[PDB]
Design a protein around this ligand. Structure first.
Ligand code: NAP
Ligand code: MMV
Length: 159
């Protein structure tokens, strides 16, 4: 399983609002860092500009049509087909455009379900558990810093 989706979405599959995350969940950032460190993130241009700096200790690949894009510490690709040449474990990082382009191609999905309803303008595509086996489902821990219930799902495409 070398090609995966990595996403956090709420009960209505909202993933973003005005180029930011609608929630603050440190546990989920830790989850991303644990899964992706030492591997490769592929993300759309808008998601990269939301993040600003590339994330440390992993390969950052940005998909953009902009031939002027040349950011220190960032690798640039210009086509969806470029993804299939990246070595190692590749995580599709978002945003909405990337997720829709890749949900039918990935081997598996690491989904953080945020158990709330936020205002969004960007969405993860609908998906059915008739196509996806639950490899694991783990409730996130609530504390002073993580106040929204959340569940970590690992889904694997059924054969
Ligand atoms: N909750 C999560 O898991 C999560 C994850 C990621 C992002 N987000 C949120 O989602 C929103 C951003 O998503 P978005 O869909 O608006 O933007 P995006 O997918 O991050 O970026 C869209 C851009 O990516 C480039 N791109 C996409 N497909 C391409 C293709 N086939 N060929 C070439 N370039 C391509 C284009 O850049 P150019 O216009 O430069 O060509 C396009 O404008 C924000 O709110 C962000 O916070 C949330
Ligand atoms: C941490 C959110 C997140 N969580 C999971 N499980 N998968 C993602 N693909 C994901 O999105 C990562 C890409 C977009 O992330 C952002 C979008 C807007 C602002 C900030 C960030 C991440 C950096 C941060 O939150 O400090």
């Amino acid at each position: 399983m070398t090609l995966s989706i990595l996403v956090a979405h709420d009960l209505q599959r909202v993933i973003g609002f005005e180029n930011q995350l609608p929630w603050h969940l440190p546990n989920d950032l830790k989850h991303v860092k644990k899964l992706s460190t030492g591997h490769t993130l592929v993300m759309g241009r808008k998601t990269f500009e939301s993040i600003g700096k590339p994330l440390p200790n992993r390969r950052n690949v940005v998909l953009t049509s902009d031939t002027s894009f040349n950011v220190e510490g960032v690798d640039v690709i210009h086509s969806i087909e470029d993804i299939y040449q990246l070595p190692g474990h590749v995580f599709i990082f978002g945003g909405q455009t990337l997720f829709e382009e890749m949900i039918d191609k990935v081997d598996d999905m690491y989904i953080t379900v945020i158990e709330g309803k936020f205002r969004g303008d960007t969405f993860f595509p609908p998906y059915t558990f008739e196509d996806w086996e639950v490899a694991s489902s783990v409730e996130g821990k609530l504390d002073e810093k993580n106040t929204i219930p959340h569940t970590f799902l690992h889904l694997i495409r059924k054969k």
